[PDB]
């Protein structure tokens, strides 16, 4: 793995929790990780989770929340029929997009996930190959 | 296929991209500071390894009215360790330097700067000097 990046025993993870003043939104966090050649960290098994936890330990970043690459995201007819026709007014539909939800990691031994407004300022975790 | 970052002059035939930094007289830096700045971006002070790369930079100069300005390049005098000779210039064969010697000769004093006119010529000057500067980055890479 790159310059000190949690080595999955596969994937490399790196925490980013410098200060509460430079926390980013999910989108910014994702741009930051992508500009590095990777992306926001994805957790696909217990192993990957232990790794991030060791990183949290090794750095003393207990209890901090981190953005993970978790993201959520059309209209259907109730009766089941297919949407073979549309007559939306200009710009419609549009409400189903004023808010989006993303998943954050609770940095304690439970290592649990919670979804929240993708616009919250948070620490984040990247993953490079 | 590697491509150049958010608008940086791309060397059509190589893997380098260039960007001018001429924010004005009160923004100028030293070779080392300029180097720190460029590497901080994930790049480095610009190297000119051929004519095409030189032309890419000249086109950057033109597109920004940066005519007649001076820019730092990654050009730096390295002080080859084979440089010592005797008083008449004869080469040194036998040697009896103390432990760790020689070593004062390694002090970095001279760096290269680019004259932003059509000549695109280089001049070696004291690295302490304040100049505008140019960075380069590898394609496929983002600042
Ligand atoms: Ca809850
Ligand atoms: Ca929730
Ligand atoms: Ca000179």
């Amino acid at each position: 793995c790159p310059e000190d990046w949690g080595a999955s025993s596969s994937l490399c993870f790196k925490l980013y929790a410098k200060g509460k003043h430079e926390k980013k939104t999910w989108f910014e966090s994702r741009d930051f990780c992508r500009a590095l050649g990777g992306d926001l960290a994805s957790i696909n098994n217990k192993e990957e989770q232990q790794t991030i936890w060791r990183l949290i330990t090794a750095s003393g970043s207990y209890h901090k929340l981190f953005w993970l690459g978790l993201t959520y995201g059309g209209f259907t007819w109730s009766d089941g029929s297919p949407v073979s026709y549309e007559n939306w007014a200009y710009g419609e539909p549009n409400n189903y997009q004023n808010v989006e939800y993303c998943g954050e990691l609770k940095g304690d031994p439970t290592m649990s996930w919670n979804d929240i407004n993708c616009e919250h300022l948070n620490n984040w975790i990247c993953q490079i190959q």
Side-chain angles (χ1 to χ4, degrees), chain A residues 41-62:
Chain A
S42 58
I43 300 191
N44 309 71
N45 59 60
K46 320 279 192 171
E47 183 186 65
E48 294 184 352
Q49 171 174 137
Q50 295 205 312
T51 303
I52 297 187
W53 172 243
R54 310 180 204 302
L55 293 180
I56 289 181
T57 297
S59 75
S61 309
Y62 302 106

Side-chain angles (χ1 to χ4, degrees), chain A residues 81-111:
Chain A
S81 56
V83 192
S84 65
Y85 173 73
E86 294 176 59
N87 198 210
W88 297 99
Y90 188 83
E92 294 289 322
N94 59 343
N95 287 63
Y96 68 105
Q97 286 183 30
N98 291 321
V99 185
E100 297 203 296
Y101 298 101
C102 293
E104 64 175 357
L105 160 76
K106 192 190 219 63
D108 61 23
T110 68
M111 290 282 83

Side-chain angles (χ1 to χ4, degrees), chain A residues 101-102 104 113-117:
Chain A
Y101 298 101
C102 293
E104 64 175 357
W113 314 341
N114 161 63
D115 74 315
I116 49 175
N117 195 324

Side-chain angles (χ1 to χ4, degrees), chain A residues 70-84:
Chain A
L70 282 173
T71 165
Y72 186 78
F75 288 75
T76 273
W77 287 113
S78 59
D79 79 322
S81 56
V83 192
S84 65

